Amino acid sequence: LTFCEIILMEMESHDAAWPFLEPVNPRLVSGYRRIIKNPMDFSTMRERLLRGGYTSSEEFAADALLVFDNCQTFNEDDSEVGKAGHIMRRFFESRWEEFY
Ligand SMILES: CNC(=O)c1cc(Cl)ccn1
């Protein structure tokens, strides 16, 4: 869970991390409530981590991949959020496989 802190901090401070810092506001994003069943962002993961709500690193990795799966589900690959999402997803997978 130490590395979970390291990689979350690096993700939170990443350049392309702007679409995933805060939860998506369904009032502002049309159809998001309908398309995405399990919304997830970095702050939600951050709150769960500080509270200690992560049993294992796998549960952490699950929510991380959930962020990028949700991004790919709702946004186009050539969209601004989509392009930022591909950067963040590749960043996570890379750093995650470095440690483990
Ligand atoms: C992760 N962010 C999104 O999925 C998103 C998508 C759109 Cl269209 C607007 C704001 N946020």
DSSP for 10-59 reads HHHT-GGGTTSSS---TTTSTTHHHH-SS---HHHHHHHHHHT--SSHHH
Q: What are the boundaries of each domain within the chain?
A: 1-100
From 33, 44, 68, 81, give the residue whose CB has the most ligand 1 atoms within 8 Å, as the site to mutate. Answer: 81
Name the experimental technique. Answer: X-ray
Query: For residue 29, which amino acid is it?
Result: V
Which CATH fold would you assign to the domain 1-100? Answer: Histone Acetyltransferase; Chain A (1.20.920)
Taking CB atoms and a 6 Å cutoff, what residues make up the pocket around ligand 1? 19-20, 24, 29, 71, 74-75, 81
Taking each helix axis from N to C terminus, what angle separates 2-12 and 42-51, rounded to the nearest 10 degrees? Answer: 150
- Protein residue closest via CA to atom 8 of ligand 1: 29
- Token pair in block for residue 5: 């802190």
Resolution in A: 2.7
- Protein residue closest via CA to atom 2 of ligand 1: 19
